[PDB]
Design an enzyme around this catalytic site. Structure first.
Site, PDB file in Angstrom:
ATOM      1  N   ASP A   1     -40.520  31.031  22.006  1.00  0.00           N
ATOM      2  CA  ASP A   1     -41.130  30.109  21.039  1.00  0.00           C
ATOM      3  C   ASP A   1     -40.241  28.886  20.779  1.00  0.00           C
ATOM      4  O   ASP A   1     -40.751  27.775  20.602  1.00  0.00           O
ATOM      5  CB  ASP A   1     -41.402  30.816  19.695  1.00  0.00           C
ATOM      6  CG  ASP A   1     -42.796  31.460  19.592  1.00  0.00           C
ATOM      7  OD1 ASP A   1     -43.524  31.599  20.591  1.00  0.00           O
ATOM      8  OD2 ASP A   1     -43.169  31.855  18.449  1.00  0.00           O
TER       9      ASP A   1
ATOM     10  N   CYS B   1     -49.354  23.407  29.848  1.00  0.00           N
ATOM     11  CA  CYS B   1     -48.755  24.045  28.672  1.00  0.00           C
ATOM     12  C   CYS B   1     -49.437  23.553  27.392  1.00  0.00           C
ATOM     13  O   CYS B   1     -50.664  23.557  27.289  1.00  0.00           O
ATOM     14  CB  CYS B   1     -47.236  23.789  28.611  1.00  0.00           C
ATOM     15  SG  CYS B   1     -46.787  22.039  28.541  1.00  0.00           S
ATOM     16  N   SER B   2     -48.853  23.323  26.265  1.00  0.00           N
ATOM     17  CA  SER B   2     -49.662  22.796  25.159  1.00  0.00           C
ATOM     18  C   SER B   2     -49.951  21.295  25.319  1.00  0.00           C
ATOM     19  O   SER B   2     -51.120  20.891  25.363  1.00  0.00           O
ATOM     20  CB  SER B   2     -48.993  23.098  23.816  1.00  0.00           C
ATOM     21  OG  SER B   2     -49.926  22.799  22.765  1.00  0.00           O
TER      22      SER B   2
ATOM     23  N   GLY C   1     -48.803  19.504  28.100  1.00  0.00           N
ATOM     24  CA  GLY C   1     -48.816  19.186  29.525  1.00  0.00           C
ATOM     25  C   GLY C   1     -47.713  18.246  30.008  1.00  0.00           C
ATOM     26  O   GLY C   1     -47.924  17.543  30.998  1.00  0.00           O
ATOM     27  N   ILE C   2     -46.547  18.227  29.340  1.00  0.00           N
ATOM     28  CA  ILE C   2     -45.448  17.362  29.781  1.00  0.00           C
ATOM     29  C   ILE C   2     -44.108  18.063  29.799  1.00  0.00           C
ATOM     30  O   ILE C   2     -43.210  17.675  30.555  1.00  0.00           O
ATOM     31  CB  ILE C   2     -45.368  16.075  28.919  1.00  0.00           C
ATOM     32  CG1 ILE C   2     -45.127  16.400  27.441  1.00  0.00           C
ATOM     33  CG2 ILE C   2     -46.632  15.269  29.075  1.00  0.00           C
ATOM     34  CD1 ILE C   2     -44.920  15.127  26.523  1.00  0.00           C
ATOM     35  N   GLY C   3     -43.923  19.084  28.958  1.00  0.00           N
ATOM     36  CA  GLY C   3     -42.608  19.691  28.857  1.00  0.00           C
ATOM     37  C   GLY C   3     -42.317  20.822  29.839  1.00  0.00           C
ATOM     38  O   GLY C   3     -41.678  20.605  30.883  1.00  0.00           O
ATOM     39  N   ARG C   4     -42.725  22.050  29.487  1.00  0.00           N
ATOM     40  CA  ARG C   4     -42.697  23.146  30.473  1.00  0.00           C
ATOM     41  C   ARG C   4     -43.404  22.762  31.776  1.00  0.00           C
ATOM     42  O   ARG C   4     -42.941  23.113  32.875  1.00  0.00           O
ATOM     43  CB  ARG C   4     -43.357  24.396  29.890  1.00  0.00           C
ATOM     44  CG  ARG C   4     -42.656  24.921  28.636  1.00  0.00           C
ATOM     45  CD  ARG C   4     -43.428  26.054  27.966  1.00  0.00           C
ATOM     46  NE  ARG C   4     -43.018  26.196  26.579  1.00  0.00           N
ATOM     47  CZ  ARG C   4     -43.554  27.061  25.719  1.00  0.00           C
ATOM     48  NH1 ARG C   4     -44.542  27.857  26.107  1.00  0.00           N
ATOM     49  NH2 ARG C   4     -43.094  27.116  24.466  1.00  0.00           N
ATOM     50  N   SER C   5     -44.557  22.099  31.669  1.00  0.00           N
ATOM     51  CA  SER C   5     -45.297  21.694  32.870  1.00  0.00           C
ATOM     52  C   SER C   5     -44.452  20.781  33.751  1.00  0.00           C
ATOM     53  O   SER C   5     -44.471  20.886  34.994  1.00  0.00           O
ATOM     54  CB  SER C   5     -46.592  20.980  32.470  1.00  0.00           C
ATOM     55  OG  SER C   5     -47.561  21.854  31.870  1.00  0.00           O
TER      56      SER C   5
ATOM     57  N   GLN D   1     -39.269  17.205  27.831  1.00  0.00           N
ATOM     58  CA  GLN D   1     -39.372  16.774  26.428  1.00  0.00           C
ATOM     59  C   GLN D   1     -38.055  16.816  25.651  1.00  0.00           C
ATOM     60  O   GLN D   1     -37.981  16.214  24.564  1.00  0.00           O
ATOM     61  CB  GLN D   1     -40.366  17.669  25.673  1.00  0.00           C
ATOM     62  CG  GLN D   1     -41.801  17.369  25.933  1.00  0.00           C
ATOM     63  CD  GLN D   1     -42.733  18.344  25.187  1.00  0.00           C
ATOM     64  OE1 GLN D   1     -42.787  19.544  25.478  1.00  0.00           O
ATOM     65  NE2 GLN D   1     -43.443  17.828  24.214  1.00  0.00           N
TER      66      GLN D   1
END
Ligand SMILES: CCn1cc(C(=O)NCc2ccc(F)cc2)cn1
Length: 282
Positions: free
Chosen positions: A181, A215-216, A218-222, A262
């Site tokens: 989280d 992801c939420s 669409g820029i970080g984990r993705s 991010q």
């Protein structure tokens, strides 16, 4: 500089925030006028995350062709990806319309539906074989065929049917379920194992449309997923693998979608993943 020793040099000097801010300063700025039209407000999860006009995916619809999704096309690596936000209650039908129209084989999900006590995306796929989903606005039917639950991720086989033509296709859903989280994983080992499972399925290969990864926002984990994949592929293709510059690859990818990676912790995690991954490949 090489990667592994540039890495230790940033750790010892504690300058990850300064490196990451340089990237933010140098990143491309292109217009996103379609995303900001008033008629599209309920199609965007976050007001500060928008697809550029030049690289946005268009729905094959004449009323409103907008979805918050971008085509990342990596020319030297010969890989393409679609990066998108987690679907909203009023965009689940658009999401599957895009999967159909772009001929994707696989969907990669890097978040849980609920995180930190709040909803991060809609429940957009069916959870029981006998309870299929119908998306009436885009005329698609979606059925759960099988599910394989492992310790760090779950793989699902889905059937997508275009109800207008009665054509059907098999879609693979790769769901990474253990990203914490807060922060990033301590070791990249399970993320790399997951990436290799997506690769082995054919979902990233040229005989299919681009993989869809979210992801939420669409820029970080993705962003971490496609950056690691492309860097490792370039290290296999080039005569000199130490020439691969992860900061340059990231800036190339940011020509196609804003904000990829991010936080400075996500940047450090991407370096770690590429470093460890390059040893396993050989
Ligand atoms: C030894 C036989 N064998 C075939 C596969 C295979 O089809 N791999 C690709 C694939 C991955 C995930 C899926 F859900 C469906 C397909 C694995 N073992």
């Amino acid at each position: 500089m090489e990667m592994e020793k540039e890495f230790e040099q940033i750790d010892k000097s504690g300058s990850w925030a300064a490196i990451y801010q340089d990237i933010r300063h140098e990143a491309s700025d292109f217009p996103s006028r379609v995303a900001k039209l008033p008629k599209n407000k309920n199609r965007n999860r976050y007001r500060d995350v928008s697809p550029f006009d030049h690289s946005r995916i268009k729905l094959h619809q004449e009323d409103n062709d907008y979805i918050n999704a971008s085509l990342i096309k990596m020319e030297e690596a010969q890989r393409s990806y679609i990066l998108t936000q987690g679907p909203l209650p009023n965009t689940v039908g658009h999401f599957w319309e895009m999967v159909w129209e772009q001929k994707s084989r696989g969907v990669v999900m890097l978040n849980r539906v609920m995180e930190k006590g709040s909803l991060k995306c809609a429940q957009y796929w069916p959870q029981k074989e006998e309870k299929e989903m119908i998306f009436e606005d885009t005329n698609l039917k979606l059925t759960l065929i099988s599910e394989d639950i492992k310790s760090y991720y779950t793989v699902r086989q889905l059937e997508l049917e275009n109800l207008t033509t009665q054509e059907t296709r098999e879609i693979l859903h790769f769901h990474y379920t253990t990203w914490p989280d807060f922060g990033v994983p301590e070791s990249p080992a399970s993320f790399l194992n997951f990436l290799f499972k997506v690769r082995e399925s054919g979902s990233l290969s040229p005989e299919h449309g681009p993989v869809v990864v979210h992801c939420s926002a669409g820029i970080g984990r993705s962003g971490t997923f496609c950056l690691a994949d492309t860097c490792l592929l370039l290290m296999d293709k080039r005569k000199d693998p130490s020439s691969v510059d992860i900061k340059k690859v990231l800036l190339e990818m940011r020509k196609f979608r804003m904000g990829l990676i991010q936080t400075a912790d996500q940047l450090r995690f991407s370096y770690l993943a590429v470093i460890e991954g390059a040893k396993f490949i050989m």
